[PDB]
Paper text:
Protein tyrosine phosphatases (PTPs) play a critical role in regulating cellular functions by selectively dephosphorylating their substrates. The ∼280 residue PTP catalytic domain consists of an α/β structure, and biochemical and structural studies have led to a detailed understanding of the catalytic mechanism (Barford et al., 1994; Zhang, 2002). Key features of the domain include the PTP signature motif, the mobile Trp-Pro-Asp “WPD” loop that in the closed conformation positions the conserved and catalytically important aspartate residue, and the phosphotyrosine recognition loop. Here we report the crystal structures of 22 PTP domains, including two tandem-domain RPTP structures and a detailed structural comparison of this protein family.
In the first category are TCPTP, SHP1, SHP2, BDP1, LYP, PEST, PTPBAS, DEP1, MEG2, and GLEPP1, which have a “PTP1B-like” accessible pocket that harbors a basic residue corresponding to Arg24 of PTP1B. This pocket has the potential to accommodate pY at the +1 position as in PTP1B or potentially other acidic or phosphorylated residues in positions N-terminal to the substrate pY. The new structural data and analysis presented here suggest that a secondary substrate-binding pocket, similar to that found in PTP1B, is present also in SHP2, BDP1, LYP, SHP1, TCPTP, MEG2, PTPBAS, DEP1, and GLEPP1. PTPs with particularly high enzymatic activity against generic substrates were RPTPσ and PTP subgroups R5, R3, NT1, NT2, NT3, NT4, and NT5. The subgroups NT1, NT2, NT3, and NT5 exhibited a pronounced preference for acidic residues N-terminal to the phosphorylation site.
Numbering used by the authors: 277 to 348, 354 to 500, 508 to 584
């Protein structure tokens, strides 16, 4: 995995000092330094014939080096393998499926043996389309995508997310699998969450379901995470997961390293300076909530 502890990881004490030193503007400037670096890799497949129309945004291709290939038309989906903390291919980061890519998305989920899907947007926000209706919304509804039929087995609404259990039936291989679809509901239309508590609780729900599902699946597959373009909220979610994992195991983390590394796999991960600052602030809010912080 690209996500190894260090070199140069920081304790919470060190992180407090770091962020105090730089303030909001210094952390924004740090994001701009990241953003100014040329990507590590190329984007030729994304932009090729047959594939352009499969991107939600022309300015957000995916890297050639880490793209998820479909085994079947083309092999292309705008989706990237992403490492997690000491874990190869912990995530697939992807855009909100489009009508013409719903079948590709489900083929990816089947081929990659995905058990959990994490959605961090609504279908439309502020009149901006972010995701198509690629799954059956109500219990017992289904959608057929050629040889993959997806059936809704139940929905539960929580205060900050909703959980939908889906059955994917591959009618060619004659096999069925359950996939859990989690939609986070408390990301605001503007800006970043005012508190990270619900997002971190949601992360814990997702982690636990992944663990449970993997334990039951029999002789890990990635978690699919999406937002509009698969870079902003997706990158934030994954980055916080990685940093909290390291903070759990060793009591250290490094946001700069995490985001820099992630961007070599899902290009453009972390879309705004507010998202970058949120990664720092969320971790410090967490530290406080966990009773790890003394103030001046
Ligand atoms: Cl965009
Ligand atoms: Cl759409
Ligand atoms: Cl988004």
């Amino acid at each position: 995995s690209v996500h190894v502890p260090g070199p140069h990881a920081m304790t919470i004490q060190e992180l407090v000092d770091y962020v105090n030193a730089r303030q909001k503007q210094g952390i924004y400037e740090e994001y701009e330094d990241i953003r100014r670096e040329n990507p590590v890799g190329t984007f030729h497949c994304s932009m090729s014939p047959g594939n352009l129309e499969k991107n939600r945004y022309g300015d957000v291709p995916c890297l050639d080096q880490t793209r998820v290939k479909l085994t079947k038309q083309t092999d292309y989906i705008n989706a990237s393998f992403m490492d997690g903390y000491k874990q190869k291919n912990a995530y697939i980061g992807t855009q909100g499926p489009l009508e013409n890519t719903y079948r590709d998305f489900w083929l990816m989920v089947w081929e990659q043996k995905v058990l959990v899907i994490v959605m961090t947007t609504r279908f439309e926000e502020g009149g901006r389309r972010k995701c198509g209706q690629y799954w059956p919304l109500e219990k017992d509804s289904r959608i057929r995508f050629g040889f993959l039929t997806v059936t809704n087995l139940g929905v539960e609404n929580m205060n900050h997310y909703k959980k939908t259990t889906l059955e994917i039936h591959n009618t060619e291989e004659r096999q069925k699998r359950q996939v859990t679809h989690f939609q986070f509901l408390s990301w605001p239309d503007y800006g970043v969450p005012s508190s990270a508590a619900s997002l971190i609780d949601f992360l814990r729900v997702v982690r636990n379901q992944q663990s449970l599902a993997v334990s039951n699946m029999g002789a890990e597959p990635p978690i699919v995470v999406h937002c509009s373009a698969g870079i902003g909220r997706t990158g934030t979610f994954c980055s916080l997961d990685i940093c909290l994992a390291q903070l759990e195991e060793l009591g250290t983390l490094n946001v700069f390293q995490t985001v820099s590394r992630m961007r070599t796999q899902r290009a453009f991960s972390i879309q705004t300076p507010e998202q970058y600052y949120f990664c720092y602030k969320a971790i410090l809010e967490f530290a406080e909530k966990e009773g790890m912080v003394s103030a001046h």
